[PDB]
């Protein structure tokens, strides 16, 4: 806003891993304040990535998070009489937000029928290099490299 | 579509068609005239022709008065044209670096 930079809310760590990042993902899953549902979907998914991939779910989750984080993005700025898609670096706060946002959104694009399944498989593919979530991070990075010429317009 | 209200006053369907034909001058600018609304009224000195129109580039609000109802209608369109032509061209001004 106009007066001051806003203060980033601190999330409570989650009672099943102690992670604030795990909490943020739960919130992004949440619809209509149904946090009990939202928590159950992540933990249900956490078991599914255990059954299909024998290693730490938390490790799978945080690796997929790092994979979807966009390092550069384009942000429009009209110069004269043309809108120039300026390439800007993403602050760590915004990286996290976009990753968790794209993770869920790309997850709910899947064909699998149960939410916990869609959340599980997207995180497995994104722990690797696949998935529509990682595609978004890559597309955004590609479009920022596309416009490196306008990088002096940064603010 | 276009709506016409005759407040505390009765008008004919012919009068309503004249209004629609007169507002048709605004079609010149080839921009969407979104739910245009005209209000004809009667005051002790003359008629008042109000209008509210939204376009993709902004809104138009104008009021016309005159003893003759058609003149008040025409004065309204004149005030509405000057606003539309401002909405359609004001952005072109700050184009040169």
């Amino acid at each position: 806003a106009r007066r001051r930079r806003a203060e980033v809310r601190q999330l409570q760590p989650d009672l099943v891993y102690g992670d604030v990042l795990v909490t943020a993902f739960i919130n992004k899953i949440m619809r209509d304040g149904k946090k009990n549902l939202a928590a159950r979907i992540f933990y249900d998914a956490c078991k599914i990535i255990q059954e299909k991939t024998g290693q730490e779910p938390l490790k799978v989750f945080k690796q997929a998070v790092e994979n979807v984080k966009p390092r550069m993005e384009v942000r429009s700025r009209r110069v004269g009489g043309a809108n120039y898609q300026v390439p800007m670096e993403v602050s760590p706060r915004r990286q996290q937000s976009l990753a968790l946002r794209w993770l869920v959104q790309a997850a709910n694009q899947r064909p699998e029928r149960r939410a916990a399944v869609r959340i599980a498989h997207e995180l497995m593919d994104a722990a690797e290099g696949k998935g529509g979530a990682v595609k978004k991070k890559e597309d955004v990075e590609r479009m920022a490299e596309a416009n490196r010429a306008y990088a002096h317009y940064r603010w | 579509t276009m709506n016409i209200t005759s407040k505390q006053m009765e008008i004919t369907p012919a009068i309503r068609q004249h209004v629609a034909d007169r507002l048709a001058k605004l079609e010149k600018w080839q921009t969407h005239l979104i739910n245009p609304h005209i209000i004809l009224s009667k005051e002790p000195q003359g008629f008042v022709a109000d209008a509210t129109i939204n376009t993709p580039n902004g809104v138009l609000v104008a009021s016309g008065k005159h003893e003759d109802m058609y003149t008040a209608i025409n004065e309204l369109i004149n005030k509405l044209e000057r606003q539309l032509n401002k909405l359609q061209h004001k952005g072109e001004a700050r184009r040169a670096a």
Partner: protein, 127 residues
């Protein structure tokens, strides 16, 4: 012998009684895990003593009234954090920095006329 705190949150008031023992916890004539059965938020109601190691050291007698489950849960967190301080004054530090001692004032904001809720405003056509 017996230790007590008063816990409040939103519209829930929880009275908690700490007696030493193996760890059993009962809320309103039910076992803890039965009252909050299927609630993920429950375990946070025992966090103050996990912060001062009294996890299995106490039994818990707990009453509860008003509000809803999670409000009642957060009320417990304050209640048992209240009791551990009267149980030992030096328990404040390493419990107060964990925030567990403060009372959460965030409550339902009143509905105002002209709005649909506290702040949600009616839709209108400025056009």
């Amino acid at each position: 012998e017996q230790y007590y705190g008063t816990g409040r949150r939103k519209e829930a008031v929880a009275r908690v009684f700490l007696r030493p023992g193996n760890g059993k916890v009962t809320v309103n004539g039910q076992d803890f895990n039965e009252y909050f059965q299927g609630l993920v938020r429950a375990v946070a109601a025992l966090e103050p003593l996990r912060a001062v190691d009294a996890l299995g050291h106490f039994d818990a007698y707990i009453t509860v009234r008003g509000g809803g489950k999670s409000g009642q849960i957060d009320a417990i967190k304050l209640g048992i954090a209240r009791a551990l301080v009267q149980y030992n004054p030096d328990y404040r530090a390493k419990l107060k920095p964990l925030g567990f001692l403060t009372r959460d004032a965030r409550v339902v904001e009143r509905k105002k006329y002209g709005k649909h809720k506290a702040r949600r405003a009616p839709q209108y056509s400025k056009r």
